[PDB]
Design an enzyme around this catalytic site. Structure first.
Site, mmCIF file in Angstrom:
data_model
loop_
_atom_site.group_PDB
_atom_site.id
_atom_site.type_symbol
_atom_site.label_atom_id
_atom_site.label_comp_id
_atom_site.label_asym_id
_atom_site.label_seq_id
_atom_site.Cartn_x
_atom_site.Cartn_y
_atom_site.Cartn_z
ATOM 1 N N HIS A 67 109.717 15.090 46.586
ATOM 2 C CA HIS A 67 108.410 15.772 46.567
ATOM 3 C C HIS A 67 107.679 15.059 45.061
ATOM 4 C CE1 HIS A 67 110.553 18.797 49.107
ATOM 5 N NE2 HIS A 67 109.471 18.681 49.616
ATOM 6 N N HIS A 71 105.536 10.537 48.258
ATOM 7 C CA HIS A 71 105.256 11.432 49.294
ATOM 8 C C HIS A 71 103.943 12.075 49.482
ATOM 9 C CE1 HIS A 71 106.128 14.756 51.815
ATOM 10 N NE2 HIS A 71 105.633 15.690 51.014
ATOM 11 N N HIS A 105 98.962 18.379 47.710
ATOM 12 C CA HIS A 105 99.871 19.305 48.550
ATOM 13 C C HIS A 105 101.063 19.786 47.800
ATOM 14 C CE1 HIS A 105 102.359 16.447 50.736
ATOM 15 N NE2 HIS A 105 103.072 17.372 50.986
ATOM 16 N N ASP A 106 101.527 18.970 47.161
ATOM 17 C CA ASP A 106 102.948 19.284 46.457
ATOM 18 C C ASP A 106 102.797 19.126 44.953
ATOM 19 O OD1 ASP A 106 104.867 20.109 48.457
ATOM 20 O OD2 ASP A 106 105.259 17.973 49.057
ATOM 21 N N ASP A 216 103.212 16.036 56.647
ATOM 22 C CA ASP A 216 104.204 16.486 55.815
ATOM 23 C C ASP A 216 105.580 16.112 56.126
ATOM 24 O OD1 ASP A 216 105.072 17.502 53.084
ATOM 25 O OD2 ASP A 216 105.237 19.691 53.937
ATOM 26 N N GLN A 268 120.860 17.094 60.590
ATOM 27 C CA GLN A 268 119.626 16.045 61.099
ATOM 28 C C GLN A 268 118.965 16.244 62.694
ATOM 29 O OE1 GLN A 268 117.176 14.139 59.018
ATOM 30 N NE2 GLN A 268 118.080 16.061 57.962
HETATM 31 C C1 LIG Z 1 114.294 24.860 58.116
HETATM 32 N N1 LIG Z 1 115.112 23.816 58.509
HETATM 33 C C2 LIG Z 1 116.065 23.992 59.420
HETATM 34 C C3 LIG Z 1 115.218 22.743 57.587
HETATM 35 O O1 LIG Z 1 114.372 22.736 56.532
HETATM 36 C C4 LIG Z 1 116.185 21.713 57.713
HETATM 37 N N2 LIG Z 1 117.653 22.084 58.041
HETATM 38 N N3 LIG Z 1 118.228 20.616 57.883
HETATM 39 C C5 LIG Z 1 119.802 20.722 58.223
HETATM 40 C C6 LIG Z 1 117.645 19.780 57.485
HETATM 41 C C7 LIG Z 1 116.280 20.087 57.092
HETATM 42 N N4 LIG Z 1 114.991 19.630 56.829
HETATM 43 C C8 LIG Z 1 115.016 18.327 56.511
HETATM 44 O O2 LIG Z 1 115.769 17.551 56.716
HETATM 45 C C9 LIG Z 1 113.544 18.123 55.998
HETATM 46 N N5 LIG Z 1 112.822 19.020 55.552
HETATM 47 C C10 LIG Z 1 111.575 18.598 55.081
HETATM 48 C C11 LIG Z 1 110.567 20.035 54.713
HETATM 49 C C12 LIG Z 1 111.331 21.231 54.458
HETATM 50 C C13 LIG Z 1 111.082 20.422 53.174
HETATM 51 C C14 LIG Z 1 111.049 17.480 55.126
HETATM 52 C C15 LIG Z 1 111.842 16.208 55.616
HETATM 53 C C16 LIG Z 1 113.083 16.632 55.944
HETATM 54 N N6 LIG Z 1 113.963 15.648 56.379
HETATM 55 C C17 LIG Z 1 113.804 14.164 56.321
HETATM 56 C C18 LIG Z 1 112.865 13.639 55.333
HETATM 57 N N7 LIG Z 1 112.940 12.124 55.385
HETATM 58 C C19 LIG Z 1 113.463 11.391 56.245
HETATM 59 N N8 LIG Z 1 114.096 11.834 57.341
HETATM 60 C C20 LIG Z 1 114.299 13.082 57.338
HETATM 61 MG MG LIG Z 2 105.483 21.287 49.804
HETATM 62 ZN ZN LIG Z 3 105.201 17.948 51.243
#
Ligand SMILES: CN(C)C(=O)c1nn(C)cc1NC(=O)c1nc(C2CC2)ccc1Nc1cncnc1
Ligand SMILES: [Mg+2]
Ligand SMILES: [Zn+2]
Length: 315
Positions: A67, A71, A105-106, A216, A268
């Site tokens: 973050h 980003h 935003h962050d 995002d 994932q």
């Molecule tokens: C609500 N749930 C189920 C989740 O947030 C969740 N659950 N798992 C198992 C993984 C999750 N989120 C992310 O992986 C993720 N989240 C954000 C957001 C919440 C902050 C952004 C990117 C993400 N991934 C990613 C990033 N850059 C490269 N490749 C993949």
């Molecule tokens: Mg944020």
């Molecule tokens: Zn963000």
């Protein structure tokens, strides 16, 4: 005029949704200004105020694994690509506000979720009971705007300034993923009943909300090598938060436990199916030219399946 340009490879590839802004921090303000000049116009902002604003925003992002400043610019570039491929649909105030919303935003993110702040009893949880970090990000945006020589919206009327700040406020709040589920559901029905109406301001708000979620998460829409390496960066944060949950004597949820490292490929998979794919599917329905985001999201879903079947590795 003094027009911003980019090297030949960047000039061409920045128009692709899957563009990566590269590892040279010193080039990202130049890239952001170029995107502002081309999506908004060269007269949208006084160049001197924009530069001061940009460098003050950068200074108020923190040295965190995910973050961070990179980003912010990445999220802004995804918004740039959505705007350039749907240019007839958006207002002057929206082009101005949305790229700035994405950069800000962050702001001042310490790499912890709204949940950790509630369990930690952080003072910000007292101030803002929901969308805690997101209300802080907006608060930080307003502070910066109010620094001497930083009012990039100085030429707007009082009521325009208020509209653009209201666009930015709602765009930043929309990045609270807890709000995305409800917003996507509403937008899904609205589209499948033929009620969705882009002249309806409460409907514009929801669509921009969805664009902010899409922007995002846009790290799942990059080429596989970018998506895979960027996933280490987010888990570096999730695991540091889980440690902190454990220090409070609270069991973190699975994705934040560094002992469950071997379950990342399945987590994932879970995330693409429950969050990402729905997100870009609904965004593609509403904005057809945003297709390549969903395509690249499916391609990376397929890559995580290859990792689960041991045909690919996650070094
Ligand atoms: C609500 N749930 C189920 C989740 O947030 C969740 N659950 N798992 C198992 C993984 C999750 N989120 C992310 O992986 C993720 N989240 C954000 C957001 C919440 C902050 C952004 C990117 C993400 N991934 C990613 C990033 N850059 C490269 N490749 C993949
Ligand atoms: Mg944020
Ligand atoms: Zn963000």
């Amino acid at each position: 005029l003094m027009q911003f340009t980019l090297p030949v490879r960047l000039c061409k590839e920045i128009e692709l949704f899957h563009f990566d802004i590269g590892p040279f921090e010193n080039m990202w303000p130049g890239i952001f200004v170029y995107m502002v000049h081309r999506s908004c116009g060269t007269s949208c902002f006084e160049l001197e105020k924009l530069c001061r604003f940009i460098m003050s925003v950068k200074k108020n992002y923190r040295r965190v694994p995910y973050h961070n400043w990179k980003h912010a610019v990445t999220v802004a570039h995804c918004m740039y690509a959505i705007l350039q491929n749907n240019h007839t649909l958006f207002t002057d105030l929206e082009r101005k506000g949305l790229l700035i919303a994405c950069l800000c935003h962050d702001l001042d993110h310490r790499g912890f979720s709204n949940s950790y702040l509630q369990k930690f009893d952080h003072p910000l949880a007292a101030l803002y009971s929901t969308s805690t970090m997101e209300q802080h990000h907006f608060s930080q945006t307003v502070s910066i705007l109010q620094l001497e020589g930083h009012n990039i919206f100085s030429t707007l009327s009082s009521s325009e300034y208020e509209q653009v700040l209201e666009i930015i406020r709602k765009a930043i709040i929309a990045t609270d993923l807890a709000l995305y589920f409800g917003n996507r559901k509403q937008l899904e029905e609205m589209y499948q009943t033929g009620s969705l109406n882009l002249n309806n301001q409460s409907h514009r708000d929801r669509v921009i909300g969805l664009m902010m979620t899409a922007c995002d998460l846009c790290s799942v829409t990059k080429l596989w090598p970018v998506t895979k390496l960027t996933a280490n960066d987010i888990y570096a944060e999730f695991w540091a938060e889980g440690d902190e949950m454990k220090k409070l004597g609270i069991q973190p949820i699975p994705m934040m436990d560094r002992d469950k490292k071997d379950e990342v490929p399945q987590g994932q998979l879970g995330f693409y199916n429950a969050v990402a794919i729905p997100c870009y599917t609904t965004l593609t329905q509403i904005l057809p030219p945003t297709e390549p985001l969903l395509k690249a999201c499916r391609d990376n879903l397929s890559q995580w399946e290859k990792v689960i079947r041991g045909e690919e590795t996650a070094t």
